[PDB]
Design a binder for this molecule. Structure first.
Ligand code: HEM
Length: 291
């Protein structure tokens, strides 16, 4: 199965900047969600989970088809809580009914990262909705209770290398774990709706203790009130990952550049862009537009 990007008929950068802006304005307005964290983090996670079902071996799953809109995928236990990001996007889709579902879910993540003061993420249009029977089965998203070998092997299926994995995991600066959702509880740091390299700094500099949470699962906790999942902590247990964690903890711009590339790649696995497709779009933030 080849998925060829097909530009929404007649649309160009200004149309997608208008969608960006609508997302960004709602992000600013609906600020109460999740004890005033806001919707940025869950929109980033929605973009990742809708892309991270991809299998490089047969091009099943991935962002192209926007299949999260079907009950098998929206009810994946791995996706518990993402309905909040979907509900956020619903009025955006109603205003811009021409955008595909995959383009909207992925653009939500780009818009969230950028509006949270993260790197620019180039973004390409042209995902096309595919039918209900193309929805990937549950079980393609990763478990959190595992070690570095698990994480490395998992991400090979998404064609990500060590550097790409460690960079992508930096998104855990954002938001928090919620016990009723995943069986883990707590934020990874203090700046959890501003995109920074804090995840790496906290991994290296907090005093972590291996504790059980109230769902009887182990997680790493600090006196500051932060947590790390076992898979997060694996990045400092494995010496290859550890070197890269130190690099990003010591170079904010390098993390931003590497995250941008890996996140674009994640959002584009499985898609064939014709030679004459538009170049990737770099959207202006609301701040840059004076809005
Ligand atoms: C080994 C890989 C990963 C594992 C096991 C993992 C696991 C988790 C878990 C258990 C949660 C908490 C869900 C909840 O209780 O609300 C979470 C949240 C989150 N993850 Fe991941 N994650 C992984 C990779 C990633 C990647 C690659 C990104 C995106 C680039 C990402 C972005 C997020 C975000 C932004 C949140 C916060 C959501 C919120 O606050 O609602 N994660 N992750």
């Amino acid at each position: 199965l080849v998925h060829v990007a097909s530009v929404e008929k007649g649309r160009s950068y200004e149309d997608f900047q208008k969608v960006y802006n609508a997302i960004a304005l709602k992000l600013r307005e609906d600020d109460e969600y999740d004890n005033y964290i806001g919707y940025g983090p869950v929109l980033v996670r929605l973009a990742w989970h809708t892309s991270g079902t991809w299998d490089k071996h047969d091009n099943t799953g991935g962002s192209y088809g926007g299949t999260y809109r079907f009950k098998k995928e929206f009810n994946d236990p791995s996706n518990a809580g993402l309905q909040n990001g979907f509900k956020f996007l619903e009025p955006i889709h109603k205003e811009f009914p021409w955008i595909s579902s995959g383009d909207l879910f992925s653009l939500g993540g780009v818009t969230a990262v950028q509006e949270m003061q993260g790197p620019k993420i180039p973004w390409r249009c042209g995902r096309v909705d595919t039918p209900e029977d193309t929805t990937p089965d549950n079980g393609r998203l990763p478990d959190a209770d595992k070690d570095a070998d698990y994480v490395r092997t998992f991400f090979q299926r998404l064609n990500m290398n060590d550097r790409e994995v460690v960079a992508l995991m930096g998104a855990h600066a954002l938001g928090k774990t919620h016990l009723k959702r995943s069986g883990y509880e707590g934020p990874w740091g203090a700046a959890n709706n501003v995109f920074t390299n804090e995840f790496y700094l906290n991994l290296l500099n907090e005093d972590w203790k291996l504790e059980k949470n109230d769902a009887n699962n182990e997680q790493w906790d600090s006196k500051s009130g932060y947590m790390m999942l076992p898979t997060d902590y694996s990045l400092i247990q494995d010496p290859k990952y550890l070197s890269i964690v130190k690099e990003y903890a010591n170079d904010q711009d390098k993390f931003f550049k590497d995250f941008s590339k890996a996140f674009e790649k994640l959002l584009e696995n499985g898609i064939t862009f014709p030679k004459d497709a538009p170049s990737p779009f770099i959207f202006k933030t609301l701040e840059e537009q004076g809005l």
